[PDB]
Amino acid sequence: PPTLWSRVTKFGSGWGFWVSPTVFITTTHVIPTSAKEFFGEPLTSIAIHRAGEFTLFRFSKKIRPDLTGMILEEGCPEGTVCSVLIKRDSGELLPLAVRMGAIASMRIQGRLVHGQSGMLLTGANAKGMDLGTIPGDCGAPYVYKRANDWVVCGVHAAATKSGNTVVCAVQA
Amino acid sequence: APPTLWSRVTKFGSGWGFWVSPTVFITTTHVIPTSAKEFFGEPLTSIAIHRAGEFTLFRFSKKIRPDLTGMILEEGCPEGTVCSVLIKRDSGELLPLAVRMGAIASMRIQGRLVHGQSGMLLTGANAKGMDLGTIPGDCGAPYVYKRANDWVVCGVHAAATKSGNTVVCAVQ
Ligand SMILES: Nc1ccccc1OCc1ccccc1
């Protein structure tokens, strides 16, 4: 039975997430700007829905038929604790707890990013240990469990140099 | 976590153990087969076994792992330390689970009385199950943290509560 982790896939300059056999979500800035296909499908066959730093792809055929469809929502209630599902090219999997806040336009290393704010709950400074995000992590999904149901609520768009603050881009 | 730490994590009995040095191997007592008389092709005679509850240390007369340097083993860590539990999963995926350590504790978990250093997972809010939390096959995985320029091992995985949010480190 396929884990959540099998849905996290290397893509462009970062990552994305399979919501169902036909639906893939990612951060807009990691998508190649020169392409004629993705995952073997011509771009003519792909519906692309862009909303700021959130992009959804809907494929005309089943790319990941091994998966069931899961619930995608437009962010989550303020105060929800989500996990960001970070994969690294070493083969490490780094699920990190994040407390989610308001939807806002936030100044992150001198640039405006719009999405749902969050604060990492892994403590003082990750630097040294596997406790924080890095630039190559963009497009990792934000997920949480709600009774028996898993929910995905957005994708990793930005983080401060400091480490504490992240932005989860969300569906419009 | 550094490659040399992952190199020390060894599939053993019904779980894992960890090479502290060329001659010293630590594990959780319950993953050792009750009938076993040989370890790394050496007989019991040629091994010094030091057992304290669910913590077992093996000291070999011969260098079994001459590729390794000896590192620091401590008796648990200060309350408040964030550790990584070095868990290997189905296919070369490496899961360094973040945990905030607390007090020494005595608990009853399912059918067992367990004693060691308690902690709480920092991977998400509802960690039960294999994606964000521990499973029974994880017993013996090491708890490690970075101190200034050194890494330390401070225990081995012994148990997790029914909810999966609390874990127990067996300590020397
Ligand atoms: N919820 C909340 C409310 C106030 C301050 C922190 C908070 O996070 C809770 C929390 C959950 C998982 C792992 C660590 C912490």
Curated annotation (Swiss-Prot), chain B:
Transmembrane segments: none annotated. It catalyses: Endopeptidase with a preference for cleavage when the P1 position is occupied by Glu-|-Xaa and the P1' position is occupied by Gly-|-Yaa. Residues 1-172 form the Peptidase C37 domain. The active site is at H30 (for 3clpro activity), E54 (for 3clpro activity), C139 (for 3clpro activity). Processes the polyprotein. 3CLpro-RdRp is first released by autocleavage, then all other proteins are cleaved. May cleave polyadenylate-binding protein thereby inhibiting cellular translation. Homodimer. Monomer; in solution. This is 3C-like protease. The chain holds residues 1100 to 1271 of 1788 of the full protein.
